[PDB]
Design an enzyme around this catalytic site. Structure first.
Site, PDB file in Angstrom:
ATOM      1  CG  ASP A 219      -1.687   1.329   1.333  1.00 37.10           C
ATOM      2  OD1 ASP A 219      -2.629   1.504   0.532  1.00 37.10           O
ATOM      3  OD2 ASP A 219      -1.365   2.179   2.200  1.00 37.10           O
TER       4      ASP A 219
ATOM      5  CG  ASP B 170      -0.801   6.550   3.339  1.00 33.93           C
ATOM      6  OD1 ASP B 170      -0.921   7.787   3.232  1.00 33.93           O
ATOM      7  OD2 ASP B 170      -1.628   5.835   3.943  1.00 33.93           O
TER       8      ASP B 170
ATOM      9  CD  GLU C 227      -0.665  11.209   4.290  1.00 31.62           C
ATOM     10  OE1 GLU C 227      -1.454  11.244   5.252  1.00 31.62           O
ATOM     11  OE2 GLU C 227      -0.509  10.181   3.605  1.00 31.62           O
TER      12      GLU C 227
ATOM     13  CE1 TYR D  86      -7.776   9.857   6.978  1.00 29.19           C
ATOM     14  CE2 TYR D  86      -9.443   8.197   6.467  1.00 29.19           C
ATOM     15  CZ  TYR D  86      -8.113   8.574   6.567  1.00 29.19           C
ATOM     16  OH  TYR D  86      -7.113   7.676   6.270  1.00 29.19           O
TER      17      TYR D  86
END
Length: 540
Positions: A288, A290, A292, A367
């Site tokens: 995965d 991620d 950012e 979120y």
């Protein structure tokens, strides 16, 4: 007549195909992969003929033979497959073989094949669910969570998930490569320790101790080869074969290195280390990413470029190829997913419509839309729609999804995210019409572990009574609590909001749901994630 019945002699019975130095601090000294484990067995015979041939039987299958030259002997052989075997020493001659009683030997391997299923009972409010909806139901488990938060792998309600992402795998790199870490107490220093002697831009483990050395339920023996989270996750795969356990590389403070991936030399080095990583730790089902936010706007204010969008698509492409290469060598199937920003401004910096062809799932981080990181503009941190007091709100779940759908991304790839925590501000004031979100804050709200953030567990247990005002904004589909006296405002997800997102996923035919760190939930959030997606209750 047949030989006498031999007896197995004292001696270690635990071995491993993949050796792990339970004391190493550097990843390069932590693991050494072998093609087979070196096993040794010795025996005695105090009565009867010794036979002429001695054999070592593993579960009845011969694994070694040799001349039987005495009432005592030793056999050294290799075992290329993990498991708990019933080992026996058999003495044989012209007319018959005589086997000794069975002694168990353990041949450890990173796929957990040597471990007994880690089937723990659900805790707190967690209720059993069958993953029969066909939809994704995932959550993140943070590596560091085994300390203060004291939330280990055995507390994970694994039966109520389809995907489990690991608390972030780092990318080696010192000054100028992982500066964002310097903001967290001893974190940067910890990573240099793990990467000691390791080329920069290679994958590594941030906290070796928490990952493979700390004793945890199921792996507490002082001499077990794999302990910590990894050890437990291995046992967890034995209990839930279909559970996809994926290592997430990146995160808020470990994304810095990605901004250098533009240089294919580094990208290749990275993709190669990931492969070697997946070969070493067999319990993982893929990777995965991620990163950012490609294009900047992340933790580091000095990184980001227009080149990032292209790099990301290249990265996913090369990773997918690497995994395919790996599948041809193991026969297994690997998933490639990524967590991305839900903001349209960032989503457009990437051609997801193309990257999606290499990815299995896209975890939309719907979120953190608002938070103490901005004391002037308040709003729902994880709402589904825009509120009534500001229908033109940008950061919302639906906008994020639409932005992707607009690009041409297949809805089945999109997994909407939910929060198992709340963000809040303190001393909110200057609001009108009794809508706190319209005012401004003076600072962050007192958090559970760090300012501006509170576990849903603490929200539901401490801020659902007293002077706290509870309100569920039906327009945006988001709840929030407010303490007038102190001006404390907290925005979060609750059973109802999560349910709204679930039905939403069902309606738009999206991939599913996932949540940020399973340690912060008491069960309400995950329970709702499952129910709203169609999963049937009752243990399966």
């Amino acid at each position: 007549a047949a030989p006498g019945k031999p007896t197995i002699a004292w001696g270690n019975t635990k071995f491993a195909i993949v050796e792990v130095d339970q004391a190493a601090t550097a990843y390069n000294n932590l693991v050494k992969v072998k093609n087979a484990a070196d096993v040794s067995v010795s025996w005695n015979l105090w009565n009867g003929d010794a036979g002429t041939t001695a054999k070592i039987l593993l579960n009845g299958k011969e694994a070694w033979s040799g001349p039987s030259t005495g009432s005592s002997g030793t056999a050294n052989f290799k075992v290329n497959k993990g498991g708990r075997y019933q080992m026996q020493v058999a003495l044989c001659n012209a007319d018959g073989c005589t086997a000794s009683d069975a002694t168990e030997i353990v041949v450890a391997d990173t796929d957990g094949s040597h471990l007994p299923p880690l089937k723990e009972s659900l805790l707190e409010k967690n209720k059993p669910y069958k993953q029969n909806s066909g939809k994704v139901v995932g959550s993140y488990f943070v590596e560091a969570g085994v300390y203060g938060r004291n939330f280990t792998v055995d507390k994970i309600p694994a039966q109520n998930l389809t995907h489990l992402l690991y608390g972030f795998i780092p990318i080696c790199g010192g000054n100028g490569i992982n500066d964002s870490l310097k903001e967290i107490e001893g974190s940067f220093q910890a990573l240099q320790r793990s990467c000691q002697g390791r080329e920069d831009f290679k994958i590594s483990i941030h906290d070796p101790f928490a990952a493979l050395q700390k004793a945890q339920k199921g792996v507490t023996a002082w001499d077990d080869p794999y302990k910590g989270n990894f050890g437990q996750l291995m046992a967890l795969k034995q209990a839930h074969p279909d559970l996809k356990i994926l290592p997430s590389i990146g995160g808020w403070t470990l994304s810095d290195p990605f901004f250098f991936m533009g240089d294919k030399v580094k990208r290749d080095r990275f993709v190669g280390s990931v492969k070697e990583f997946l070969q070493t730790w067999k319990f993982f089902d893929g990777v995965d990413i991620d990163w950012e936010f490609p294009g900047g706007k992340g933790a580091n204010p000095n990184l980001g470029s227009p080149q990032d969008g292209e790099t990301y698509v290249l990265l996913m492409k090369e990773l997918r190829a690497m995994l395919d290469q790996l599948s041809a060598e193991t026969g297994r199937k690997y998933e490639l997913t990524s967590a991305i920003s839900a903001g349209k401004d960032k989503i457009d910096k990437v051609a997801y419509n193309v990257a999606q062809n290499s990815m299995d799932h896209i975890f939309l981080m719907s979120y953190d839309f608002y938070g103490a990181f901005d004391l002037k503009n308040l709003g729902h941190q994880t709402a589904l729609n825009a509120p009534a007091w500001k229908p033109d709100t940008a950061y919302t779940t639906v906008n994020g999804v639409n932005a992707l759908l607009a690009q041409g991304v297949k809805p089945g790839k999109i997994v909407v995210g939910t929060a198992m925590y709340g963000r809040g501000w303190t001393g909110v004031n200057g609001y009108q019409n009794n809508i706190p979100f319209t005012g401004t804050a003076t600072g962050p709200v007192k958090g559970t572990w760090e300012n501006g953030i509170v576990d849903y567990r603490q929200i539901a247990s401490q801020f659902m009574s007293g002077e706290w005002q509870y309100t569920y904004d039906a327009t945006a589909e988001a709840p929030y609590v407010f303490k007038p006296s102190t001006g404390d405002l907290i925005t979060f997800d609750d059973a109802r909001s999560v349910q709204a997102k679930g039905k939403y996923v069902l309606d738009k035919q999206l991939g599913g749901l996932f949540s940020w760190e399973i340690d912060a939930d008491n069960g309400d959030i995950l329970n709702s994630m499952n129910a709203s997606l169609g999963n049937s209750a009752g243990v399966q």
